[PDB]
Write a protein that binds this ligand. Structure first.
Ligand SMILES: CNS(=O)(=O)c1ccc(CNC(=O)Nc2cc(C)on2)s1
Lengths: 179, 177
């Protein structure tokens, strides 16, 4: 029962994370790239700084990671292997984290209310900043879910330990990459 | 209508996630304590004035000293939390949480929150602490810490019973208005 609640949350929150990145890309980002609205000179052609590599993070999750996690739904004790298999893809959170302070200052110093205008217009509860912290949140959350599975799965559970290892290493490496 | 970003910080022992869940759902989650609370916003009225309260969790970032501050800029109010039945979390208010919050956000109000009020009088919790030569954290200890960090209020609550819980967030909003 506990391993099932954790797996369910894993999957449900993965779905929400995919939805959240997708919303960010198709509202805040799409307005910058669209050609429909007035883009401050302070940020023009700097969507790469603002959103960092969030496209590529979304594509990973939306094309691959969510489909694979789903296949482990009835195999919670094995899900650590999913993180082992895909460990290289998580390296992109290192890039994302590195960039995030530059992103935030850029939005602060140079965007005025461009993005707030967009938020009001689309009716979004979450601000551009709220969306852009999410990869940082998600990448530090997987390790908590794996720790919870470790408290309730038997010695058939180096298929959690190695997963957790990977999911402790990625955020530490992102952390250690910051200036 | 006024928007408020409130970030919740403190050790894993505080139960940050459970706090926020219990507050926003009006119920201790009981059956299963979810590890994930996603950035949240809702309208609440405080002293008449209606307000949009934004809540961010930070659970999972407790070991990543450079990632944690990514959430700090433009915060309107912090809850700095410790568990009333973990002296080590209390001491970390001073050793860990206050320094970094101040360093990044020098003029932002802090509410000092002691969680797990329901455990301060619990025999098993008390005895588990006595076996380590410790005791729960009492009210004047929290007041003295609040004073030392510049906290605008010291408040005690339980996610379990809801005692003091709604007040924590009311006061977070009052600290901004
Ligand atoms: C000390 N941790 S424990 O021995 O695992 C235990 C956890 C929960 C238990 C029941 N009481 C609470 O959760 N009260 C809370 C949680 C928050 C936030 O504020 N009050 S007993």
């Amino acid at each position: 029962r506990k391993k099932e609640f954790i797996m369910a949350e894993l999957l449900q929150t993965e779905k929400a994370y995919v939805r959240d990145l997708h919303e960010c890309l198709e509202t805040y980002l799409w307005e910058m790239t669209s050609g429909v609205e007035e883009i401050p000179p302070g940020i023009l052609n700097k969507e790469h700084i603002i959103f960092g590599n969030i496209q590529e993070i979304y594509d990973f999750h939306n094309n691959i990671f969510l489909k694979e996690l789903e296949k482990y739904e009835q195999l919670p004790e094995d899900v650590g292997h999913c993180f082992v298999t895909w460990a290289d893809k998580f390296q992109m959170y290192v890039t994302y984290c590195k960039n995030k302070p530059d992103s935030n200052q850029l939005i602060l110093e140079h965007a005025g209310t461009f993005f707030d205008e967009i938020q009001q217009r689309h009716g979004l509860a979450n601000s551009i900043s709220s969306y852009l912290i999410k990869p940082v949140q998600r990448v530090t959350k997987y390790q908590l879910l794996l720790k919870e599975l470790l408290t309730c799965c038997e010695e058939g559970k180096g298929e959690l330990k190695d997963g957790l290892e990977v999911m402790l290493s990625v955020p530490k490496k992102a952390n250690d990459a910051m200036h | 209508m006024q928007a408020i970003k409130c970030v919740v910080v403190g050790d894993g022992a505080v139960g940050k996630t459970c706090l926020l869940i219990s507050y926003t759902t009006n119920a201790f989650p009981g059956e299963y304590i979810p590890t994930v609370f996603d950035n949240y916003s809702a309208n609440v009225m405080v002293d008449g004035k209606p307000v949009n309260l934004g809540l961010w969790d930070t659970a999972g970032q407790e070991d990543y000293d450079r990632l944690r501050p990514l959430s700090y800029p433009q915060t309107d109010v912090f809850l700095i939390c410790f568990s009333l039945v973990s002296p080590a979390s209390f001491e970390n208010v001073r050793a860990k949480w206050y320094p970094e919050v101040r360093h990044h956000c020098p003029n932002t109000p802090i509410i000092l929150v002691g969680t797990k009020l329901d455990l301060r009088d619990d025999k098993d919790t008390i005895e588990k602490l006595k076996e380590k030569k410790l005791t729960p954290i009492t009210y004047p200890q929290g007041l003295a810490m609040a004073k030392e960090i510049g906290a605008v209020k010291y408040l005690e609550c339980s996610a379990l019973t809801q005692r003091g819980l709604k007040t924590v967030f009311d006061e977070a909003i009052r600290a901004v208005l």
